[PDB]
Amino acid sequence: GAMGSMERASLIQKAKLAEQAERYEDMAAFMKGAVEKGEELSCEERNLLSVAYKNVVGGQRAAWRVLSSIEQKSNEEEKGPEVREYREKVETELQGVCDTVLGLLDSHLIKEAGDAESRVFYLKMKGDYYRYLAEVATDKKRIIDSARSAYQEAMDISKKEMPPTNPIRLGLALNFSVFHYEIANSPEEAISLAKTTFDEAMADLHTLSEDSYKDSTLIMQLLRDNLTLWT
Amino acid sequence: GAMGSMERASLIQKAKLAEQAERYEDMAAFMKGAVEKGEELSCEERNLLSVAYKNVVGGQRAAWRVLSSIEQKSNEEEKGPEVREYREKVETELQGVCDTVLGLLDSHLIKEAGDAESRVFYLKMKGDYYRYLAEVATDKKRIIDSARSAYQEAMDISKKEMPPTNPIRLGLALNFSVFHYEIANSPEEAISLAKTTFDEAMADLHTLSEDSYKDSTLIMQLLRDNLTLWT
Ligand SMILES: C=CC(C)(C)OC[C@H]1O[C@H](O[C@@H]2C3=C([C@H](C)CNC(=O)C4CC4)C[C@H](O)[C@]3(C)/C=C3/[C@@H](COC)CC[C@H]3[C@@H](C)[C@H]2O)[C@H](O)[C@@H](O)[C@@H]1O
Numbered sequence: 084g085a086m087g088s089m090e091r092a093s094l095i096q097k098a099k100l101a102e103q104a105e106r107y108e109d110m111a112a113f114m115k116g117a118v119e120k121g122e123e124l125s126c127e128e129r130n131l132l133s134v135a136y137k138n139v140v141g142g143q144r145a146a147w148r149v150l151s152s153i154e155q156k157s158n159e160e161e162k163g164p165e166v167r168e169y170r171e172k173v174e175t176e177l178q179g180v181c182d183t184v185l186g187l188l189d190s191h192l193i194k195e196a197g198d199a200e201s202r203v204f205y206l207k208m209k210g211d212y213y214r215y216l217a218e219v220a221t222d223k224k225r226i227i228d229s230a231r232s233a234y235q236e237a238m239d240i241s242k243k244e245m246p247p248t249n250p251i252r253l254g255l256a257l258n259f260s261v262f263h264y265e266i267a268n269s270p271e272e273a274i275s276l277a278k279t280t281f282d283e284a285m286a287d288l289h290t291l292s293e294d295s296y297k298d299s300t301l302i303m304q305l306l307r308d309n310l311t312l313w314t
Numbered sequence: 315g316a317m318g319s320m321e322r323a324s325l326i327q328k329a330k331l332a333e334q335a336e337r338y339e340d341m342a343a344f345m346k347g348a349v350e351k352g353e354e355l356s357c358e359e360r361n362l363l364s365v366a367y368k369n370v371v372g373g374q375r376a377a378w379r380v381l382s383s384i385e386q387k388s389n390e391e392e393k394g395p396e397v398r399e400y401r402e403k404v405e406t407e408l409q410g411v412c413d414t415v416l417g418l419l420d421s422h423l424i425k426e427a428g429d430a431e432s433r434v435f436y437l438k439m440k441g442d443y444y445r446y447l448a449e450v451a452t453d454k455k456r457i458i459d460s461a462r463s464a465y466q467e468a469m470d471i472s473k474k475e476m477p478p479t480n481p482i483r484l485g486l487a488l489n490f491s492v493f494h495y496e497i498a499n500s501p502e503e504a505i506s507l508a509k510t511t512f513d514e515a516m517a518d519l520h521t522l523s524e525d526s527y528k529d530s531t532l533i534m535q536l537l538r539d540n541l542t543l544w545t
Pocket residue numbers: 102127128130131133134137204205207208250251254255297298301302
């Protein structure tokens with residue numbers, strides 16, 4: 084790989100610089116290089132990995148949605164193949180990034196993660212990137228099943244090993260509920276998961292750390308925001 | 315080039331789609347392909363070209379400024395070569411984009427542009443991209459002279475052939491005044507140019523078209539904003 088000649092510590096340092104400069108493609112490349120050094124990632128390093136790729140795919144998803152919207156309208160004046168072609172171009176790029184992330188998770192990170200915090204983190208990521216693949220799929224069924232199984236394994240571990248207000252547990256439940264509502268045609272499951280997650284976190288807030296209070300209350304607010312939209 | 319197999323009209327269509335999707339790197343590549351078909355660009359097509367590359371280089375400049383700021387602080391604890399290396403990486407990418415734009419202007423567009431509107435537009439772009447090169451240069455003098463000479467030729471034509479409220483004339487004067495203030499160590503020239511430009515546009519506003527009123531009043535407001543900051 085192009086990062087093979089750079090020190091692991093230098094890759095981490097440059098990932099943090101790329102984050103400050105909002106250079107997320109660079110940031111992802113540095114963190115991919117770090118993962119490929121073969122050592123486990125720390126808590127801080129996992130966050131760098133997830134933020135980098137979340138921002139890269141987030142821009143691709145937003146662009147794909149704009150183009151798909153134009154395409155669907157155009158099939159409601161004929162203007163030729165260009166809209167479809169360019170949507171397909173963005174879609175292929177998006178799929179390539181998802182495949183890259185899923186490859187890192189499957190080749191390096193999930194196998195070696197034993198602590199609940201790392202294992203749930205990586206399984207959530209796996210569910211997230213299969214979900215992004217599902218959004219553009221038309222073996223959609225197989226991709227949806229892959230996302231569900233990854234989220235479900237993460238859920239089983241998080242409920243057994245983490246308190247209800249743990250930010251990773253909360254963010255996993257948020258995204259799994261969105262999967263149910265938006266992807267899997269299961270709005271009732273989505274609502275039930277979001278409500279039980281929120282309610283159980285409320286009663287646990289008297290154990291929540293000052294250092295994670297900001298993250299967890301934010302995610303709790305996103306759960307409430309979705310419940311208000313869905314009900 | 316990679317766009318050589320695509321119809322000119324398809325490249326223009328996809329540039330407009332890329333703009334709607336905020337995919338400016340794609341947008342620039344499509345417009346570069348269009349320019350390389352060898353035909354002159356229309357007014358609308360020139361705007362697509364300039365917006366695409368302005369957004370690409372704008373993100374590079376913002377990232378370069380963040381990294382340079384970190385670098386300059388670090389030379390006020392030693393942390394090794396990484397900040398300099400990554401700043402150099404972004405800088406080289408930025409210079410490559412500027413060189414690409416300047417190459418398109420010099421190989422295709424400036425020679426064939428005879429109408430005042432196209433010729434002033436392209437000469438302004440030439441000044442702009444030399445200015446972006448000057449911001450990171452440490453043959454800085456030669457680059458600064460190249461920007462000044464391009465802006466000056468554009469200024470001479472615009473005052474001879476365009477009314478004072480023409481948006482291209484106004485935007486050229488805005489950017490040349492910023493060049494004087496920020497690049498060329500000539501704040502008094504910057505202030506004088508901005509003030510005479512603003513004053514002469516005010517007295518011409520009774521000829522300004524309804525269709526260009528929005529563009530010109532916007533640029534006039536930017537001139538006033540700079541005058542307020544500078545005085
Ligand atoms: C490594 C350095 C950097 C700067 C990149 O870290 C970024 C953040 O990383 C931790 O937050 C993570 C985190 C957040 C929280 C919600 C950000 N909170 C706020 O906006 C509060 C208002 C102030 C969103 C991210 O996408 C990130 C890394 C991702 C996930 C997500 C990861 O699923 C695989 C599960 C939940 C959340 C969990 C993992 C959260 O714990 C820190 O705690 C935060 O301070 C910090 O901003």
